Ligand binder design. Structure first.
Ligand SMILES: NC(=S)NNc1ccc(F)cc1
Ligand SMILES: NC(=S)NNc1ccc(F)cc1
Ligand SMILES: NC(=S)NNc1ccc(F)cc1
Length: 344
C-alpha cells in the first residue's frame, strides 16, 4: 500500500480549494523514484465543471480520498507483477485539477474553481526532497491518459526545478502512456474545448513549444507529435495504435468507409512515432497500460513493455537483443495476437 500525504502548503489546492496531495511508499534501498500522474478527462467552463463536481467529485476534491491505495502494474512492489522497477520508491499523484496538469490559477473572488495542476507537481517534488528524493539518481515522471499528456507538458519543468534548487545530478525522465493524440477529422460530425480550457485554467505549456506556435495557438502543445520534438528530457512513449479515447472523440463506435478511416488512423499514428526512438505501440483497440496489473501480457516483435523499459534504462547509461523502438506494422486492431481480449 501507498499512504496518503496532504500537501503541507495548503494554498496548492484541488478544484474546490481542498488540499492536493500524494500517495507514497518508500524503498530506502533504492535510488529510483517513480512519480505517476493519474488521468480522467478535464472540464472547460463553469457549467461543465459544475456537472463534473456532482458525479466525479474525487477528481475535483480531496475531502473523500482514502488513507491508502494499492500499487499496481509499474507501481507494484512485487517482482512478478513489475519486472521493471519493483524496488523503486513509488508515488501516485491524484488528478484533482481537471486541467490536463497545465493550470496555474488559484480560486478567488473572480474564479469559482482553482486550476493548479502544474503547481501541484512542483509542490509534490519540493516536499519529497525532504523525504528522500534528494538522494535520487533517477526521477521517472509517468502518467496515463490525461496524465500521459501531463508528462509531456511538465517533464522539462521538473528538470528545470531540480537544477535551480541545487540538485543537478538527479536524472529526470518521462513516460507518457495513452496521452499521444491526433487532431484529426472525425468519422462523423475537440480542439476548441482545449483552446477554451487553456484560457479558463490560465494553462501553461513548455516554453520552446510556446515560442514556435506563439500567442493564441498554445493548444497545439497538447498534441504529442507537436510538443515532443521540443522537449529536452528523455521521454518513452506508450500508445495503443487504436486508442479507445481517440476513437470516442472521433465518433467511432464494418463497411468500406469506416474500414478506410480506421486503417488511416493507425497509419497516421505509426507515422508520428517513426522518429521517436523510445516507444511501444501495439496494434490493439484498448486504453491505458502501465498501471494495469496484467501489463506484462502484451508484446511487440516478441518484446514485452517491462523489457523495453529496461532496455531504455540501459541505453541511457543500439543494443543487441534489447530494443527500445517497438511499433506494430500490421494495420487492423488485434492483428497482434497479444492484444487484450476482454478484461479481468
Ligand atoms: N477537432 C479537430 S480540430 N480536427 N482536425 C481536423 C479537422 C478537419 C480536417 F479536415 C482535418 C483535421
Ligand atoms: N458520446 C460518445 S460515446 N462520443 N462522443 C464524444 C465524447 C466526448 C467528446 F469529448 C467528444 C465526442
Ligand atoms: N485483458 C487481457 S487478456 N489482459 N490484460 C492486459 C493486457 C495487456 C495490457 F497492456 C494490459 C492489460
Amino acid at each position: 500500500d501507498l499512504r496518503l500525504h496532504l500537501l503541507l502548503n495548503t494554498s496548492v489546492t484541488c478544484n474546490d480549494g481542498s488540499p492536493a496531495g500524494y500517495y507514497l511508499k518508500e524503498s530506502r534501498g533504492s535510488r529510483r523514484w517513480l512519480l505517476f500522474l493519474e488521468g480522467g478527462w478535464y472540464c472547460f467552463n463553469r457549467e461543465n465543471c459544475d456537472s463534473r463536481y456532482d458525479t466525479m467529485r474525487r477528481l475535483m476534491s480531496s475531502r473523500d480520498w482514502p488513507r491508502t491505495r494499492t500499487g499496481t502494474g509499474i507501481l507494484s512492489s512485487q517482482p512478478e507483477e513489475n519486472p521493471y522497477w519493483w524496488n523503486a520508491n513509488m508515488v501516485f499523484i491524484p488528478y484533482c485539477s481537471s486541467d490536463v496538469w497545465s493550470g496555474a490559477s488559484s480560486k478567488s473572488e473572480k474564479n469559482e474553481y482553482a486550476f493548479m495542476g502544474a503547481l501541484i507537481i512542483q509542490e509534490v517534488v519540493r516536499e519529497l526532497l525532504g523525504r528522500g528524493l534528494s538522494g535520487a539518481k533517477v526521477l521517472l515522471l509517468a502518467g496515463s491518459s490525461a496524465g500521459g499528456t501531463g508528462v509531456l507538458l511538465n517533464v522539462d519543468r521538473v528538470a528545470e526545478q531540480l537544477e535551480k534548487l541545487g540538485y543537478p545530478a538527479i536524472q529526470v525522465r518521462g513516460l507518457a502512456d495513452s496521452g499521444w493524440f491526433l487532431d484529426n477529422k472525425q468519422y462523423r460530425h475537440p480542439t476548441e474545448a482545449i483552446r477554451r480550457g487553456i484560457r479558463y485554467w490560465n494553462g501553461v505549456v513548455p516554453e520552446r513549444c510556446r515560442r514556435q506556435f506563439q500567442e493564441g495557438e498554445e493548444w497545439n502543445c497538447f498534441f504529442g507529435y507537436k510538443v515532443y520534438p521540443t522537449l529536452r528530457s528523455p521521454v518513452f512513449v506508450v500508445q495503443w495504435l487504436f486508442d479507445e479515447a481517440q476513437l470516442t472523440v472521433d465518433n467511432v463506435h464494418v463497411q468500406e468507409g469506416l474500414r478506410l478511416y480506421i486503417q488511416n488512423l493507425g497509419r497516421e499514428l505509426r507515422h508520428t512515432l517513426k522518429d521517436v526512438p523510445a516507444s511501444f505501440a501495439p496494434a490493439c483497440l484498448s486504453h491505458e497500460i502501465i498501471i494495469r496489473s496484467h501489463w506484462t501480457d502484451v508484446q511487440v516483435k516478441g518484446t514485452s513493455l517491462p523489457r523495453a523499459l529496461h532496455c531504455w534504462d540501459r541505453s541511457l547509461h543500439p543494443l543487441k537483443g534489447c530494443p527500445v523502438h517497438l511499433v506494430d506494422s500490421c494495420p487492423w486492431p488485434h492483428c497482434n495476437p497479444s492484444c487484450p481480449t476482454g478484461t479481468h
